[PDB]
Amino acid sequence: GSSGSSGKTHLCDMCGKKFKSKGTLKSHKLLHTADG
Numbered sequence: 001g002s003s004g005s006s007g008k009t010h011l012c013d014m015c016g017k018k019f020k021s022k023g024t025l026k027s028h029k030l031l032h033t034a035d036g
């Protein structure tokens with residue numbers, strides 16, 4: 001996970017996926033928190 005650039009577009013530094021809305025990025029983020 002590399003810290004990206006402060007961009008409105010909800011960007012995921014965990015994998016590198018960009019989203020327009022939050023709810024979308026959220027559900028996608030939860031997936032990352034699997035092992036932990």
Ligand SMILES: [Zn+2]
Pocket residue numbers: 012013014015016017028029032
């Ligand atoms: Zn991600």
